[PDB]
């Protein structure tokens, strides 16, 4: 559920 997946 990270909302901005690319930020991982």
């Amino acid at each position: 559920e990270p909302q901005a997946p690319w930020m991982e």
């Epitope: 559920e1 990270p2 909302q3 901005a4 997946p5 690319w6 930020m7 991982e8």
Partner: antibody, heavy 116, light 112 residues
Framework: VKLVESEGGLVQPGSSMKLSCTAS????????MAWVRQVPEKGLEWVAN????????YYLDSLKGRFIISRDIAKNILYLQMSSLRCEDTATYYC??????????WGAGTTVTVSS | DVVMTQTPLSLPVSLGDQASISCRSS???????????LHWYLQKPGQSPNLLIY???NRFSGVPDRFSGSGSGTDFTLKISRVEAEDLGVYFC????????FGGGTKLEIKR
Amino acid sequence: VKLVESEGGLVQPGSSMKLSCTASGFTFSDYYMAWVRQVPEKGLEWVANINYDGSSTYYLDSLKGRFIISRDIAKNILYLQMSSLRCEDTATYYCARLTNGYLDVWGAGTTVTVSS
Amino acid sequence: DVVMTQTPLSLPVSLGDQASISCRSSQSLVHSNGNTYLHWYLQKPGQSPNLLIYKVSNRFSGVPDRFSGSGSGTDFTLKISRVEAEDLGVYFCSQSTHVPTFGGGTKLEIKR
């Protein structure tokens, strides 16, 4: 339901301006938010996004930190501070709600023109 | 820098016929968490983009079952069955698996 951008308009090259976006209808701090811009000829470009409480942000690298995304949780407002503008920043700027990687609510857009 | 390439640039279709729009990515869109963050938006004339399909194949609230997204990896397709005039506009794919980027768009034209 509804994001409304501030009036954009004309700014001199090298000067600064701040857009705002007013959120309504949801718990603002339960969603990430983003700014996206569109220039004719052409193409959408992701500008910035921000997490729930504003402790983590992402910016398009080429902006070189000239842009700041922030949110006033107490007033349901999203900001985009833009510094040292060049003509390449002329565009329609959209406020958007970000959920699980996608933009599920978009504002009406506001145009910013960088010109002398 | 992930490039999203859309084919064709413009697509003319008769009312009631099917439109098929291709979107390819230059890198796999399968995130390490297993999700594929590939989405489709429609921008109608004089309007903001709105979300149509998220995560490859999920229809957003309010989108008719006529709109169907499919694909995996680097190859994706949006299919619009039984086209209606109000479907016209520019369809954009977008990825957010990596630093987010958008396709250049495909213009749906209605034949008369």
